[PDB]
Each structure stands twice: as C-alpha cells, then as structure tokens.
Amino acid sequence: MKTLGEFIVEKQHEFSHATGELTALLSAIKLGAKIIHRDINKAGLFANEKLKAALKARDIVAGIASEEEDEIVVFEGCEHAKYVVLMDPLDGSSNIDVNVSVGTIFSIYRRVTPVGTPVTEEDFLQPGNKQVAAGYVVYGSSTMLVYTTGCGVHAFTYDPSLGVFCLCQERMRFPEKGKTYSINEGNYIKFPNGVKKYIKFCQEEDKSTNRPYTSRYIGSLVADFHRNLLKGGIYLYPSTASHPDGKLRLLYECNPMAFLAEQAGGKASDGKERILDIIPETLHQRRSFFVGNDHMVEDVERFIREFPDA
Amino acid sequence: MKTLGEFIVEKQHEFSHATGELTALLSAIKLGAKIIHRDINKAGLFANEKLKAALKARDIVAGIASEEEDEIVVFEGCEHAKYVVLMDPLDGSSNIDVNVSVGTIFSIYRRVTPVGTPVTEEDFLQPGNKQVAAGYVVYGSSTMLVYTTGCGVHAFTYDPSLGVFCLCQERMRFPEKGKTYSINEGNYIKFPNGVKKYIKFCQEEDKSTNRPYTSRYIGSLVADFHRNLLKGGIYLYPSTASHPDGKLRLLYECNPMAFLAEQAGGKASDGKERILDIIPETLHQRRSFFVGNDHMVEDVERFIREFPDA
C-alpha cells in the first residue's frame, strides 16, 4: 500500500535537483482536498478560501487564479515562489445542494515573470501545453484524487479509516474504446450542426461499433470526466445559445482536463484544434470542449468538419 | 435535532393500535442503510445479501422480493409476520465502480394471505396503491434517507460523526415548477413519438416558461429522482429498442417512487395511466415511467396523446 504523500516524494526523488517546492505545493493541495472532503460529507450536519488560505498560509505559491474571482490573487510574502495555480475549488457547485458528485480542479504552471516580484496575468495566460501539473478531486459516493505531471495519470482513493489517499493506479488510461457520451441536450437548439450530427451517430443501431451509445450527464465536469476516464466515453460542451463561445473556462477547466485526458491516452479539442495549444487571450476566456476517448473526439471533429455552421 | 430512530417511534404512537412490528421493520431498513453506506464509502480504499441476511436476522418480515443484478429473488421469512418487502438493494449498481451516486429502494406491503401461513406471490403482486411505506437511500457526496408511510415525504440527512440520520424535512414537496428533464437519449431511435416531441418542447427557447430546460441524467434512478424532488424536474424511461415495455421494474422501482412522488405533490405514470393503480401480473414486470413535477408529466402524457405510435 502506497500513500499519495509517499508517492509525491518518490517522484520528486527522480529529480536530483528538485528543491521540494513542487512537492510542498502538491502536498498542500491534497490537504486542501481533505478539508473540502470533510465539509462536503457534512452538509446540513468556503471551499474557495479553504484552498486559498491553506495554500497562502503555507508560503507555497506565487499566486492563484480562482474560477469565480474575476482577478488573480497575489500571495504576499510568496513573491519568491515560482509556481502559480489556477483552480476551480468547487466544480459542479449546483450539485452540492442535491447530494450529487462535485469536484475540485487544479492546474500548475511555472511563472514567466521574475521570481521575487509580484505575479501578473501574464503568468496565468500561458497555453495549456506549459502546465507543470494538473489534477482533480472527485467527491462522490467515495473520494478520489487524480493528477499528472507529464508522466501518466496517477489515481488515488481516499481511505476514511486511515485519513490518507492510497495509490489505486500509477498510470490510469482510457479503455480501448468508449460507448458513453455526456452532454446537456437541453441546449440542443443552437448546437453546432456537427454536434447534432454526432449525437445522431451515437444513437444509430450498430452492434459492431457498440452503438447506440448510452448517455450520462451528472452536471459536474469532474464527475463526468472521471466516469469516462474509468469506463471510456466522451464529454461535450459546445457553443450554445447561452454561451456562443462555449461555457467552460479555457484556463480553469479545459486546460487541466485536457492535460489529464492526453496523459491517459485520450484527446481534448475545441472541435477544430488541440486545447493545449490554444494561446489564451483573457483570464475568463471560454471555449468549446470535447474530451475523452480518442476515437470519439475524432468523430466529433469529423462531423464538425463535414457539417460546418453557417 | 431529531433522529430517525426517534421520529419512527413518535410516528408509531400516533396509532393507538400499533404493536411496533412496522417500527421494527423501518428500523431494520435504516440499519441496513448504514451498513450499505459503510461498504460503499469503502470503494477500494453486497448490499443485497447484507440486507437479506439482516432482515432475516430478526424474523421481521413474512417475505422479501428483490432485484439483484437484473435478477429477481424471493426470500421466505417469518410466517407470523404480516408485512412483506420488495426492494432494490443497489440501484444504479454500475455507478459504484466510478464513485458516482447510487441508491437503495424499498417498498412495504401488508400481506394479503393469512398470518401464520407461508407467503405466496399474491402477497407481492398488489397494486402500488396498497403500499404501507416506500422510500430510498441515496449514497452520494453525502447520504440521505427519504421515505413515506402516507403522511408526507420525510427526508433525513446522515450525520457520520454521530452515526445517526437527522430529520431534515417532515413533508418534502416538489417546488411549484420544474425545469430539468432526465432521460437516456442514447436510446432515442425507438422512443415513442410523444417522448421525442416532448424533448423538442423541452429544448424550445421560451423564457416565460423556463425553457429551454436543463438536462441531467446521473444514471441512478434514486439520484436523479432525489435531485428532481429537491429542485423540481422530471425523470423519464419510456419504451426503447432494448426494452419494448420500459426498463424499470414496476414492483421494485416504479411503485415505490410513484408513492413518494405523489406524496410530494408530484405525478407518476407509464405515459397513459397512474402507476400506483396498475394491477401487476408478474414479479418481473417492467413499465414505462414518467415521474416528477405534475405539469411536466402532464405534458408528456399530452404529447403522447397528440402523437400516438403505430
């Protein structure tokens, strides 16, 4: 049995010149996860500050950009830190009031501004391919923490009886094929033609290709992503009438999940280009997102190409 | 603060003739919920056997009919008992492997055969309107037990720090209106024409009626039902290519949930008639199911009328 704490240190030791700064940051994030886990499991019987405070009170990160807050947060006294964190403290917030799965998403980048000075939006506007690490914590029937630093997707399950995250899989990967699609069809009307065509494709009868597919949409990016990673599948959030540029935030949701998806052998695009290669323009920039099994994402890209929108 | 154990006893004393037999049954079911909660929260660091072995451990039921892995099992209990139980120990079982919400469903009936004799199938084939009690346990981000005996939908939240279920609401009810629909569109192709038309209706742009609706489908009857009860909405599982007569079992899923829905001010039908009044023919009978806010279920019934199937 190996704990997340032991695992992080073991990976650090593969880098003889590591100083322990990244290890300290990942360790602080897992502590934040335990705190959130505790509060969630006792609703009726915050998250944003919990992670910020937990991280700030530890002089471990130069700054943080939180999905809610319109502006970054510069940690005083941590100007000498080299990493910045972008986070979605509570993904699928809505589900909290109904006892359904929710999650936390995090993305880590090495700052571009000089260490010793205050971070700027420039440190938070780097393309996804610059991520040092990314991960999520899914709080459901049980809790799991999943992350990557570029050498695979490490999955851990929280053991309440011990109060620690235990290694589940050192290199989690999407299964060979997927047969589940996750999308909110309530916004069907203005879905791009390609997405409507893809959904049709998903509903056709064809045993040879595991069709018709089954649909699942929890309402939490993290939870749906997690299920698709474990059993195979695809998550889709295209442009809609309410969100012409897509709903998900490129920097707080798309980039982190795309990094994880790729490291698990999957794919993540906006329907036409690789999510991780998009050069961000603003902190709250939104983007269409299709992520999951490679063959499924490729199908979506095919239909979008073949059935353009006027 | 009031515990479920205390609540059950208080209710018993509202009946001068009560002997405590039903109380012992409701109490055993609550304990079973705790056992399942434990096993589930320990994914890796079933409910069916534990429940049966428990419900027999005290000879508190005349017999039990259960749905286990698409298989229906009947168990013989104490011939001197007057209540019979139908259950779904694990609803949405496949969700267990992905740390997603799952639940338990139970339904109680007073036997029709004379006490002191062995129970027959007739004791389990009564129409839903004869239920003495119905309820579910939802194991998600947190756990809740919801049940009814005819005087409202009582909702309780589990307090892990004390190991007790705490009263949340004595009479839970659907909000005035709903704006969420839950269905597996993967089986779209052979949905009845009315259901396809209803989905279209749900997607039209019309603010005055909260449209387009939002879509959510966790994959667990209990979890989706639970969410729609708390926030309003409708769950649908019509006839499909794979299940010509619907997928849900009339006895272990439809009747119990219908009892709860009506008690909460909602409606439950198979598309044309009231679920609770259907006279069952077999222990494995399946049925189309539409349940949730009344105006939503009425819409489905209407569209099915305006657009019949050949």
Next chain:
Amino acid sequence: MKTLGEFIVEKQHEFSHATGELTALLSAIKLGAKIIHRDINKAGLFANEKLKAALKARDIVAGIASEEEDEIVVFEGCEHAKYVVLMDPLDGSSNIDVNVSVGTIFSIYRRVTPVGTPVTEEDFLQPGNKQVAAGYVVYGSSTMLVYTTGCGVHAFTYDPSLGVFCLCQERMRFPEKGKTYSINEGNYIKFPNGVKKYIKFCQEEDKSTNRPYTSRYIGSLVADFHRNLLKGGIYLYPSTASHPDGKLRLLYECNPMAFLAEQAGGKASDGKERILDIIPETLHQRRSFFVGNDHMVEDVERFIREFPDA
C-alpha cells in the same frame, strides 16, 4: 450482529404491558453517549448539558440529579414522566486533559412522588436496591456501553464505522477469581487499619492464591471498574484524611456501580454493609466503596472487621 437499539426493544417486548417510556429513556441515554464520545475524541481538535439537554429536549424523564450540581433539575413539561435519573456525566474528569480513559455513569429510579407533579429530593434519595437500571459508558482506546435492569450485565462496543453500539456480551460476569487491586495509595496515611492490612495481604508471595496481586489505578472509577469486570479485580476508595467519609458519592457513583457489580456476580460494600441497602440521607452523601470480585471484597471486609480503627 445485534445493536443496542435492537436489544433495548427486544427486552421491552418481554414486558407486554411496557409503554416504551423506559426504552425511550435508555435510547436517549445512548444518544447522549454518542455525543459525548464525539466531543471527547476531538479534544483540541458541556457533557453535563449535553445529557441534560438531550434528555430534557425529549420529554423523557421527570428530573435529573447531576454529580456536579448541588441540586436536582426538574424538567418542565415532563412532570408526567415516572423516571428520574442520577448521573455522573464525566467520571474521571481530570483524565480528559491527558488523553486518558474517562466515563459516564447513570442510575435510573421510578419516582416515589405522584406522576404529574414536580419531583423532589425524595425521588432521588431512594436506596440503591430500588434502581430500575444503571450503567456506564467508558471512553478509552475504544468505547463501550455497559448496563443492567436487573437481569444481568449487557455489554456493547461502539462501532465507529457504523455509528452504533453492537452487542458484545448479553451477560457479562466477573471471572472466577481476581488478581488486581485498584486504590490511590497516595492517601495511605489515614487509610483504615483493615485496608492497610489488606494491601499487605495483596503484596504477599503466594502462587497458590495468585499473589502478589498487580495494581492498576487509572484515576477513573468507570475505567478501573471496567477493567476489573473484564479481567477480575477490586476497586477501593476508603475513608482518607481528605475524605473521612470516603470520596465517592453514594448516589451518583456507588449505587450504580454496585448494582452492576452484583449483576455481574460480584460484590459492593462500604466495608461493613451492602451498598445497595444503605438508606441515603443527603444528595451528596459520600461513602467508602469496595467493589469487584466477591472473594476480594470479602477479604477487605474481613480485615476491616478483624483490625478495627480506634
């Protein structure tokens, strides 16, 4: 597996004319125990009010006399209740600050004043032989609840994973012989001559009678009593320079523990007479106490008789 909750009800059913009032009281006490357990297991990370409030808020007892409080507590609106409770919410209080075992003691009596009127000190000054029930909860490495109603000593172990007390032994009894004595020798100087002589006896070398005995003194009546009940032994608190009449309170500590000791096949006396037959004179009356294995208590009585004090 049987829970304390199930057990209490099963015993109630042996009395066809029981109304459930005693069951409700015992049930409320166990809930109070869970509450105390929770707070104790998180020191740094009350008890009196917890039990009073928990019991009062349930209109379950006519009144309560707490070891601390100099006067009884009449529960308003519960004048119609027939039972009164004497308690030691936190026994061995001192040990709480040092992470050592502590406990809760309770004693139940049927009131003597008419139901419907306020209880008086007379209802709390009855001799121990009138107890309807008595028990304790020991909070240590793990927690256990132990009680009796006159038909043996029922022992339960708290299962944190389930949040319930599980039956350990339906009739716990002292082992055939004991070889542990528990006393605070710091107060040796004014110990009665018989007690000094008994201690000498305990220290003699004589394998045939398991001597010399081993000594153990946790500082918590409940914890020491509990260990002696499980492994055999005797607890002693005689008159001392600081407490000429003994330290323990006759009504809140001696009577409850004597009832339990006798029901477990042991003995409890003040050195000359049966504790349960002493007719109390005041609410905070103190008394010498020797309790545990019968042969050991008899030895103490023998030495006290044979070596009187001037």
Next chain:
Amino acid sequence: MKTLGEFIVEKQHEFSHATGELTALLSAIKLGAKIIHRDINKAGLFANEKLKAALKARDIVAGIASEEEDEIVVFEGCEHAKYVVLMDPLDGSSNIDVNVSVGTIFSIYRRVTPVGTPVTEEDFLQPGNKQVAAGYVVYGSSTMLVYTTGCGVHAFTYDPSLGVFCLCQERMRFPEKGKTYSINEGNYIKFPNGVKKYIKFCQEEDKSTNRPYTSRYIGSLVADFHRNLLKGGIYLYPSTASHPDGKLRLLYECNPMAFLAEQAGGKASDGKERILDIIPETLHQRRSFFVGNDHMVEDVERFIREFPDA
C-alpha cells in the same frame, strides 16, 4: 494549523546537508501510527507486523530491533540505509483487551557499521546518548504523537476528521513541580529500601510541598509517562521479586523515554546513574527506571543513597 507532515519537512530544511532519508523514516513511523490507531479503535466492533511490513515496504531502514510479546525480534532492512530503529510497537498490550490506554515507542540511531554492508548487533547496542530521535504515540480517549530529535519535545494531536496530526506544542516541558507518582505497588515486598522510603515520603502530610502526592498507574509506560509530562509526576519501575534487574527493556523503553524526559527538562535514571549514558551489553537488557520531574527523581536517588540494599 500545522500538520506533522509539514512540520517534519520544515525541520529537515533547517539542515543544509539533509537528504530526506530521516524525513522518510519519521514519515513512515507517523503512517504506522495511523494504522495502529485504526486497528486499536476497532477493538471488536498486530501493530508489530504492520509496522515491520510497512517499514520494509520502502526499504527505509538498515534494520529494526523490536519487543513483541516479551520477545525481541531483529529484522534486516536495506544495507544502503544509515538509520536503525528500535521499537515497542505495542506498549501495555494487555490494556488493549480492556479498552484502556496503550502506546507505541520508537527510537532511532545512525548506524555505526559502514553503509552498504549488513547491520550488526553493534548498531543496536549504542548508548541512549547517541539517539537521533525518540518518540511515542499514545492511543487513549484520543490520540497524540510526541517525539524529539534533540531540539525539544514536539507534541501533536490526531484529528480523525482529517486524518492528520496537528502541532500542539513545539517544546513540551514538565511543569516546575510534580505531585503524582506512578508505580505498581503490587511488587512492594522486594522493592529496594530507598523506593519504599520514597513512597513513605510521598504519603506524608505536608502542604508546603504538595504532599501527600496523588497516585496513578495506568499500566502503560506511554500513558503514565504522557500524563506525568503534561501534569508533572514521576514513573517508577525498580527491581522487584519477579524482575531483579527491573522489568523495562533498556533499549526499547528506557532510552527513548529518557531522551524525551531530558528534552522536556526532566530526569531519567536507574536509581543511581543516567540512563542515556549506560553502555548496553545485550539486546534484551532490562534496567530499573525512574523518570519524570527532576526534583522527584532526585528524591528517589537520595533515598536510595540514604537507605542502601544489602
């Protein structure tokens, strides 16, 4: 709030030459504490094997010497490790069966044999003054981990709701004076004359010096030591009829506790000389032990001088 995991890392960085090897050892011991805490809190609803299997699971120690059920076992670890560990996985083991306080003791030494070779007994026979670290875990009403590496006695409380040890005090110290003595008077007969005289001293009536003292003896070295450190006091285990050279093992109990006692401003001797300076002769060596407030241990040494044994 600071966790033990964070505290250990902070301490490591106070040493420019640190490589993280000792940190990995202290971290493994802390995890082992959590494992034992779990098993213990689950009495019925061992520490030795779990600890060894764990401390080997990562090849983090050159070797381990342990006391298990009065038996001494030696285990061979990674030849490339430079630290050796001596432990008492379960101290006061018999207390487990009675839900009483128990503990774990550990002692760490830098090996004397060259790294890269197999460890010898010489690596485990060093005098206490060569310890790199010492500490204990007390599992009682609640759990605490206390340790030292030479810069104070660091005390931590376990938070079950988060599964982490939280810093309570960086430099725990005995209060100015003590007024509690802990010893098993059951073995009185052959106590040395000085110890008998000291006990007399403890029982004299003299307010000016807080006498008579109070007596407490839980039966667990760790628990009694823990209490005396927090409230002041002295623990004594001299030579007895059953153990002519004392009962406590010099290596697994005396040295570790002596290290902690001195670091807290206390004293630890065998009655005549400093425990930490004794040169061990065997792995099973036992020794008389007097530890706690300095003035108390000095009194014992004095009485032993004024009243020698033939």
